[PDB]
Design a protein around this ligand. Structure first.
Ligand SMILES: CCC(CC)[C@H](NC(C)=O)[C@@H]1[C@H](O)[C@@H](C(=O)O)C[C@H]1NC(=N)N
Ligand SMILES: CCC(CC)[C@H](NC(C)=O)[C@@H]1[C@H](O)[C@@H](C(=O)O)C[C@H]1NC(=N)N
Ligand SMILES: CCC(CC)[C@H](NC(C)=O)[C@@H]1[C@H](O)[C@@H](C(=O)O)C[C@H]1NC(=N)N
Ligand SMILES: CCC(CC)[C@H](NC(C)=O)[C@@H]1[C@H](O)[C@@H](C(=O)O)C[C@H]1NC(=N)N
Ligand SMILES: *[C@@H]1O[C@H](CO)[C@@H](O)[C@H](O)[C@H]1NC(C)=O
Ligand SMILES: *[C@@H]1O[C@H](CO)[C@@H](O)[C@H](O)[C@H]1NC(C)=O
Ligand SMILES: *[C@@H]1O[C@H](CO)[C@@H](O)[C@H](O)[C@H]1NC(C)=O
Ligand SMILES: *[C@@H]1O[C@H](CO)[C@@H](O)[C@H](O)[C@H]1NC(C)=O
Ligand SMILES: [Ca+2]
Ligand SMILES: [Ca+2]
Ligand SMILES: [Ca+2]
Ligand SMILES: [Ca+2]
Ligand SMILES: [Y+3]
Lengths: 389, 389, 389, 389
């Protein structure tokens, strides 16, 4: 086998509903299954297989370890996976490493797995290549060293990963690691609007550029937007200019006054956002998702824009379809690409969290939408799960 | 590996009982298993593996999602599979795509998976090649776009698939899609008796011709019969002329007066029917199955006729044996072929539904009969399942 | 790959305890497993894998299908397997075909599976090669056509199988089938003491000869003994002359007066018996097993004799060790050979039935003994199962 | 494939927390899983896979066979394994052989499995290569013949294994077996301090030498230390001279007066200890672990020393980090190495026993620490398990 590279996307002009992974449809008291309790799911694909990753709390439904499953970080949390299409139960899953923050990617020869754990003030990112633990990176701002909760991206054997460190309420200046065969060979320090960047959802816009739509959890409801040049290994960050603000919470569309760079209102709090590239011969599409509600983690709409510069274009994003109605939960969302025989298929996945508060279990389903055929997006996704059962 | 083609059937002159997949033998309250709730099962084989497909309601027995499992279409419904011989439980199965109507087939190099979902008045057929979503086809009569519920058929890398759209009570004019490596490369519009055609059970009569025995759900208890020329890509449809009417409901054998084309009575309602080819050097056998009861979905008898033209032959089909007694359920039935080292083995499968009404669960066992050796068919199949447990 | 042949056995002069498969250690009300209800287990090995087969009643423990699990034949009974070392549960097992009498063997390229079902007066043997059903054999005495309940034996791609038909109380004259790539290419009619032969436990004494230790269920507690010449395809049967009578029930050792051919007393009833070959350069060992009790299916001792002719040798078999104490159940026993890199390892397996009558479940564990190292046999086997749980 | 040899360790200067296998997180009454009840876990890796071994009592939680799970040897005990990362449940595991003492190792081509069973006064070590049972070794002091409870060590196809036999309270003079493709080709009798040696944790210090840190269960809290020359096949044993005594129980560090060879106090009782090598170009690191408590099986600290001779160096071992706090259980510990593409990764594993006395179940989790990156060891491990559930 050989190193992989991004290719032209497969033909298409609309996303459709592809596949639901709702493990908790089998978690009843009256049933006989063991779906794992998770959050922060995401998908990453190699040349033959797509794997479905998540961060488990090392407990199952039904069970007696529900207390603490709404928490973010503890000493039991682990990165797990199954082959996409399999239900992530106790027996089906594989446990990769301890982690309360994760990522993964295939370089064409082998899987790289990324997981952060350790204490608040001095967390530690850990890298695993196939079966071997190979390297680490240390906390540099001593406040919850952190990573993407989605697929890293490899080209020509060089995989690029976003990390961040700092206060969830204040400054969190992100970096990028460049990783080869499980080992870190360069640190990349972005320039520009670097005040606060988290949980970048990243992909290839071409053989030369990686772009990421990220989260600012303090200052703005506009998404920070990264452009990484992989030939010179330099990165730059500015806010997205569109009036279709992609974060949650957010104010009404277009109501932030000033030029592209203004923050301005309802900027504290946030959500991880979906983002994927459609690469055509002489054109590029950018697909994004955002909650249906402006304040709450409910619903998910798909949006799209062809060409232009997301840093300077104030034009509204075209609303493509409703993937999750307002009456269903829409939490984190992410992008990934499936590898067809001669082309790549852009997809958006959506974490659909079963939230009933800290007094019962806390987990999530995963809905998948991909570019397929022509026309308009046709159907939405429900989890089907009743949390009383 | 290479493209596959239909070959000469293996030696034999009778079918026998081969294998039972009864997953609900393990769904007791007192047991510890998780068989999936399903309907519309079917089998499709490649050069090394046979896969057992079905449409699940994304629920398991025992469990608490029984409400709605008698319904036909919803947002949870999925195409799933196991390796034939494995019990399709939560953990054993793989989820391919969302769908409330399906099909699948191997072309010699890779699996093609077909699934239709979306709303009543604008459903959408979706195609997946290996792991990649690759193409779609749109509803053309805006009333439940629909497919075979059985194996498509691939020759020289070209796979052929029946679809239909229209009123289940009126006109539903079917088409055929020609699919290559996951993408549609021709639409085929049949000529002749096209008034109403559904759920074609299709196979190769030779390297030149695919034939299908289908369902008219409005007009007649004679099965519509398709002949598709795969060299010119043309298709023709006329009613089966035999006095052994294969649908359910149906009137007494031979009691429809007039020539081969007459409808005539008890034509509204219907069932998907089994049909498979036995290809010999200078002879062709056509095997078919039909319920034992004329009105009800009870029992299944196997029938056979050698040579002739099913469009013009009014001769009765030879009753070969009882596969399911009048006291066991006989719902959908289908054909498929297993690939031995140098020849193909024709088989008929039978969906045996556990029906207790809308107030409890609704699923199915699957019984398999295949051509093996000489003599007469010897034993019937029971599910063994008591629905109270 | 290539056709396999028997080779010289690996070095050793004693059997030891190898491995226990006790699936019912996990069938408590208070546990969360699904071991399959079975009887008639046996083991067969190819060049890379050993499979553990059994005849299931298509029910599990705990469950609500216990009624009928003491019965011998019904419509739900199936040949199943797992890779030796795995617990045969609902999910772990694979269902090969319907059968209430079975056998299997690998020819070096592929697995042949054998299963009989059908009605009492007209049962039917069925053959499957890999995934394909390929041939049948018909009942010839119209009274429970029947097979080995252990491994067939393949040489140079030709596999040899014992069958029988007739009254369990009267005449049952056995035959042998010669099978090649799933198809029957010769019937072999044995000569000599053919009055009554069942459930032969067969193996290679060399590239030229297969020998089998069988069961006479009517006339005698001496085991019938088959010598099949595989070059000329001829078979002969005489009673075993040893005073160490291998059947159950049996009279005291040596107490049957007359020459080698006398029946004489306590001959009605019987059991399947273990038997395997140890092939050395200029010597041959014959290993056998028999219950510890003379009347009852309790215990199992291992016995051995080097060279001679089992038809004419009245010398006592040397008692090698106790594999199952008198306080543990000892039902069917069988032989098989494991394939090490350059030599074959003889083994004896023992069905260890959990019998509590017709009012509760009925299944079995499987204990395995193999030739390994030097000295004497050291330890016995218990199932560990309490049937009340 | 080819024979494997030890290589240079991967780059790094500190261990970190890698992975937790806590199967009993899923053993609640309220849950639906079946983790196996085990003790004496260990890990061993080949060129593509790491397998997680243990000795089971052939019982699961929840279940009704808890009585006897605190015992050390019985007739049900078995060597089992899963792929490292999988939860060892009933279905996931594979049963290798009957054993109440074990070991295993890969030689580059195939897996060797070692298991001891049999009675107290005449136990028997059994060897299995891939699927075949191949050899045995007999008890030589007639008191619980015994082995490592950790990975054996293979070079150029020759695998080396420690065994012992004798009184747990008196003399137990260990030997080493040299094993090739499943068969013993040399016995090696160590010279020097041979009074009492058990459960050696062994690894390669180079292509020439194997070193083992072992357990004296009678005489001393200093660990006996073995040096095996694999070119001459000779072995020597002397006590570790360090003032950082690695056994439990043990007296205060440094308080055993006299030269390197003195016993002296609190020597009766003991524990199996972690030990692994870090092989660099011109330097060697020795990593070790020991309980946090001096008297009890609580906690586990990691210690390190570079170069010197452990037989004569009285210098204190450098304390590297706390792997398990004093409030968590710290039982057996062991070394292994994962194979990266071009270098080997040293790791320590820790058995973390759920002990609630003889009146309830007795089993263990497994925590894994590996050499990765630079800095200091950052986080500890908890099992998460409440034994009341
Ligand atoms: C405090 C920093 C947060 C990111 C802005 C926080 N991430 C971590 C690593 O703790 C996320 C946030 O608190 C939760 C959310 O917003 O859903 C998930 C949570 N993410 C994870 N538990 N992996
Ligand atoms: C309304 C059109 C019907 C076919 C004639 C209908 N098909 C769909 C796609 O809904 C079938 C029919 O109503 C049910 C049956 O007859 O068993 C099954 C049902 N089939 C499926 N649920 N796939
Ligand atoms: C009546 C003929 C018997 C052989 C002598 C009988 N075999 C069959 C196929 O029914 C066996 C016998 O009755 C039972 C036993 O002896 O344990 C098992 C039983 N064997 C199986 N159920 N496969
Ligand atoms: C009597 C000899 C002991 C070794 C010093 C004893 N070993 C055996 C093989 O029984 C160990 C010891 O008693 C128990 C322990 O210390 O944890 C485990 C126990 N080890 C195992 N059950 N494998
Ligand atoms: C990127 O590079 C490789 C050649 O190195 C090429 O085959 C591929 O088509 C390129 N990708 C795109 C999107 O053009
Ligand atoms: C169909 O075509 C191929 C050659 O292209 C041939 O090998 C095969 O035998 C043909 N099928 C039949 C049924 O004759
Ligand atoms: C049987 O035949 C093959 C050669 O055809 C040979 O390799 C093998 O050693 C022979 N078996 C015995 C037991 O001698
Ligand atoms: C040991 O031997 C092989 C060559 O036989 C070599 O490739 C390897 O590097 C050696 N190991 C060490 C630790 O130097
Ligand atoms: Ca924000
Ligand atoms: Ca009709
Ligand atoms: Ca008898
Ligand atoms: Ca000690
Ligand atoms: Y399972």
């Amino acid at each position: 086998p050989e190193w992989t590279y991004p290719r032209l996307s497969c033909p298409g002009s609309t996303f459709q509903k592809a596949l639901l992974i709702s493990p908790h449809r089998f978690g009843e008291t009256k049933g006989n299954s063991a779906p794992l309790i998770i959050r922060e799911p995401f998908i990453a694909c190699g040349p033959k297989e797509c794997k479905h990753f998540a961060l488990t709390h090392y407990a199952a439904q039904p069970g007696g370890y529900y207390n603490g499953t709404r928490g973010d970080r503890n000493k039991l949390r682990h990165l797990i996976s199954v082959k996409l299409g399999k239900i992530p139960t106790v027996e089906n899953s594989i446990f990769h490493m301890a982690a309360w923050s994760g990522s993964a990617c295939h370089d064409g020869k082998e899987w790289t797995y990324i997981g952060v754990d350790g204490p608040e003030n001095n967390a530690l990112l850990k890298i695993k290549y196939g079966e071997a633990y190979t390297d680490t990176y240390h906390s540099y701002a001593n406040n919850i060293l952190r990573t993407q909760e989605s697929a890293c991206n490899c080209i020509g054997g060089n995989c690029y990963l976003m990390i961040t460190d700092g206060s969830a309420s204040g400054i969190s200046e992100c970096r990028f690691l460049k990783i080869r065969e499980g080992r870190i060979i360069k640190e990349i320090f972005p320039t520009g609007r670097v005040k606060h960047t988290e949980e970048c959802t990243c992909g290839f816009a071409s053989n030369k550029t990686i772009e990421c739509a990220c989260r600012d959890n303090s200052y703005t409801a506009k998404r920070p937007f990264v452009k990484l040049n992989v030939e010179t290994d330099t990165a730059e960050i500015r806010l997205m200019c569109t009036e279709t603000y992609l974060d949650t919470p957010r104010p009404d569309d277009g109501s932030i006054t000033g030029p592209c760079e203004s923050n301005g209102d309802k900027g504290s709090g946030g959500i991880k956002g979906g983002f994927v590239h459609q690469r055509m011969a002489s054109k590029i599409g950018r697909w994004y998702s955002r909650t249906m509600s402006k304040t709450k983690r409910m619903g998910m709409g798909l949006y799209v824009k062809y060409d232009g510069d997301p840093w300077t274009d104030s034009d509204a994003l075209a609303l493509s379809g409703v993937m999750v109605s307002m009456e269903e939960p829409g939490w984190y969302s992410f992008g990934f690409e499936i590898k067809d025989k001669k082309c790549d298929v852009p997809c958006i996945g959506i974490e659909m969290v079963h939230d009933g508060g800290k007094e019962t279990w806390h987990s999530a389903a995963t809905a998948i939408y991909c570019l397929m055929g022509s026309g308009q997006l046709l159907w939405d996704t429900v989890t089907g799960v009743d949390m009383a059962l």
